[PDB]
Ligand SMILES: [Ca+2]
């Protein structure tokens with residue numbers, strides 16, 4: 001398989017387009033009507049940084065959890081002794097773009113547990129094969145992956 005290049009995104013369209021992760025609905029806050037859309041991920045095969053000490057990095061939508069758990073398995077098989085690591089999941093800090101999918105729990109920023117940057121291009125490729133709807137080699141320090149929202153009723 002072929003790693004992504006720095007700043008490459010797949011599919012090669014903007015994140016919030018139909019063919020990628022789709023439109024932003026709105027920010028989910030902790031005491032909001034939509035907080036129930038988020039579920040915590042307690043997978044022992046994923047390392048969550050949780051530098052906030054709030055557990056926010058673990059909260060995500062069901063589709064996000066499904067793709068992330070699949071990626072966790074492929075990371076361990078690619079590099080024995082290494083695990084998937086999440087540095088950002090749902091965000092309440094306002095530390096992303098104004099309509100970031102992190103605010104809806106539909107995006108994660110990821111690394112490997114060893115923080116070996118030489119692996120990140122391949123990590124991004126694994127995220128694509130794990131089925132994330134948009135994958136962006138955003139920083140030398142992390143990959144940004146997002147998923148579609150569930151369909152309206
Ligand atoms: Ca974090």
Ligand SMILES: [Ca+2]
Nearest residue numbers: 088091092093
């Ligand atoms: Ca955060």
Ligand SMILES: [Zn+2]
Nearest residue numbers: 107108109144
């Ligand atoms: Zn991100």
